[PDB]
Amino acid sequence: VETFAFQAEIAQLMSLIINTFYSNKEIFLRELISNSSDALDKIRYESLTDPSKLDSGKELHINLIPNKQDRTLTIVDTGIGMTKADLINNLGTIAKSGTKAFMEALQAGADISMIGQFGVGFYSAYLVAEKVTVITKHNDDEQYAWESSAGGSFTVRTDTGEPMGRGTKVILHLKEDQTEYLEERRIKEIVKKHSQFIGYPITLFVE
Ligand SMILES: COc1ccc(-c2c(-c3cc(-c4ccc(C)c5ncccc45)c(O)cc3O)noc2NC(C)=O)cc1
């Protein structure tokens, strides 16, 4: 297990997300689904010139899986998946500029729901999760587990859990007062409100 420091700007963003009073938390789901959609777009595009990239799974879709026992909401996609370099360096590098822009926009009257317009929507997960665990698998690379409870650091390890195939699984360990996001009616409502036209099937599992 390797432990890494977030870039200072990203740690600042995470603290803002955790500390700011902001009631419209439900937008976290749209942001995560948007990320899944982007990843699905990419594997779809690449498969057009190299069909063998779908050897790790032809189905392009998103599953939403609530588990009341574990107090988790999991967002699973069969997108392109992330490499170790994505997790440690490259997505953070990209997030720096977006974070800066978002912070500045907030100072000028934007609100937290607009986070995705700055390309850093993943971090909205921390509106509802005390810890986020991300399992990801890119073709020709190993399966990784990324994890953070904020506080300025994250971990990455090679994952020996159940093999995924290809894609990304975001496991939201929900805060004690945010269990509404385990309820079928609530998740359905949010998907219809904010993610109605996503171009991949979204299956909401029930318990
Ligand atoms: C908005 O920027 C991105 C969106 C999706 C992805 C992504 C993902 C993916 C990442 C995330 C994601 C998960 C976890 C973290 C820390 C992320 N940080 C920045 C951007 C995305 C992150 C996710 O929630 C779902 C996803 O399907 N899997 O392969 C990907 N690769 C390509 C080039 O897009 C990467 C960047």
Side-chain angles (χ1 to χ4, degrees), residues 32 35-36 38-39 42 77 80-82 91 119 122 134 146 168 170:
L32 294 176
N35 285 358
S36 293
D38 290 352
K42 194 167 183 180
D77 69 67
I80 194 158
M82 289 173 286
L91 298 185
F122 168 76
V134 178
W146 176 105
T168 299
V170 177

Side-chain angles (χ1 to χ4, degrees), residues 6 16 21 27 38-39 64 66 78 85 90 94 105 111 120-122 141 147 194 196 198 202-203 205:
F6 284 112
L16 183 154
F21 181 77
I27 63 92
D38 290 352
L64 307 178
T78 49
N90 296 335
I94 292 166
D111 68 279
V120 293
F122 168 76
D141 203 340
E147 190 168 69
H194 293 302
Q196 180 177 8
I198 295 293
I202 299 177
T203 301
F205 286 37

